[PDB]
Amino acid sequence: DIQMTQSPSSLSASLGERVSLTCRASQDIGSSLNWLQQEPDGTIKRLIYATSSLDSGVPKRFSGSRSGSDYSLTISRLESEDFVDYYCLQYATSPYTFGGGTKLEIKRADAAPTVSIFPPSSEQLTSGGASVVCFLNNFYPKDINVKWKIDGSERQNGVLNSWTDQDSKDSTYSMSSTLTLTKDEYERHNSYTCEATHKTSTSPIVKSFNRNEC
């Protein structure tokens, strides 16, 4: 089947800048390439058809072109609503195929995470379980590492992470990390630490508590 190699897979840019995305077809597709945009709520909308034509009611900042096996979507000047996902679609020969997508994110000033750690609740302890929760809030850029420490040692099992999308008001990312243990395994130990590594500081941000401290 025809392969569409879409690049870049991710890109950061600021308001007002120009960006272009590229789909490399593995075999000739002619002018038979669409560009699509997908909103965070899931709405897909066609932007460009037949390589270069603009859909009705699509703003003029979008345009499409080809050069050899390379097809491009160009956004002359970024507006804030443009920072979503984009896919190309070849409809030359079935099976139809999409490039792998590009997520566009807004550039902003680097920010360090605000880190908070939480002990299990007493209601939870009376169930049989103990979740330790760490929030790493409002950081930029999005690349972040969390590590859990127990009595000084690194812990990897039982750790579930969740990430928010880029926030539309301040353009930062937030992350929760949850370490889940049985009541007994939790009470076999003393200090609990979550450690965040991020570009904004050379050394990790570290939050701990001690459960024998009350």
């Binding site: 099976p95 792998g100 609740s121």
Partner: protein, 224 residues
């Protein structure tokens, strides 16, 4: 008014078959292929297959052989995709779109349905346990204090989380849910000025309509 109207969200047991529908209005139904597209959570779009109603003509991506059957009903303007032998990895949004049987560039994949979510799981409906997240008595920084609640072990999605009935929403992060066993867990955090707390209450409001669960959890200072 060209529209493609998709059937509603579906929850199905592993191994069952689901049939999705795409209902067309505003155009000659026989003149356009109906196209079916899959998107797995956080992944890209993939092409599944197509049918030209009412003809014997269907086509599909080979990955979906033995998995996807397409049919169509010209009388009700409806096209159907049946997915058989469901597994976890079938959980995705399914979109339909259309493709003109002819020679006009602007009528290829021009209008899109808004999608049908399919969830495949063995899990039974389960209310969430809701737990308060009070600081373990730290420095409480100097300026802001962060609290949360942990909403654990529920099925199916979704839950609603609010802080003080929706009044306090400014310092809020409700994180997407993740699967712990076959059950869902999420947390929410709120950041408020330390003047505000423990001075007075902070409460998280959790709703899980599918289990008819409504709960309030006040965040109570540890003091040990």
């Amino acid at each position: 008014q060209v529209q493609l109207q998709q059937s509603g969200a579906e929850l199905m047991k592993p191994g069952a078959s689901v049939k999705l529908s795409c209902k067309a209005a505003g155009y000659t139904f026989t003149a356009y292929w109906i196209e079916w597209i899959r998107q797995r959570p956080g992944h890209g779009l993939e092409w599944i297959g197509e049918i030209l109603p009412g003809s014997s003509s269907t086509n599909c991506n080979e990955m979906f052989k033995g998995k996807a059957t397409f049919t169509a009903d010209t009388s009700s303007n409806s096209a159907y995709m049946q997915l058989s032998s469901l597994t976890t990895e079938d959980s995705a949004i399914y979109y339909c779109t259309r493709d003109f049987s002819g020679d006009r560039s602007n009528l290829y994949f021009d209008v899109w349905g808004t999608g049908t979510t399919v969830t495949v799981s063995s899990a039974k409906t389960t209310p969430p346990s809701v737990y308060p997240l009070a600081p373990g008595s730290a420095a409480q920084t100097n300026s802001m204090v962060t609290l949360g609640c942990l909403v654990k072990g529920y099925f199916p999605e979704p839950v609603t989380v609010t802080w003080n009935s929706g009044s306090l929403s400014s310092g809020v992060h409700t994180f997407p849910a993740v699967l712990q066993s076959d059950l869902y867990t999420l947390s929410s955090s709120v950041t408020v000025p330390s003047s505000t707390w423990p001075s007075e209450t902070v409460t998280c409001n959790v709703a899980h309509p599918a289990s008819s669960t409504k709960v309030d959890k006040k965040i109570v200072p540890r003091d040990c």
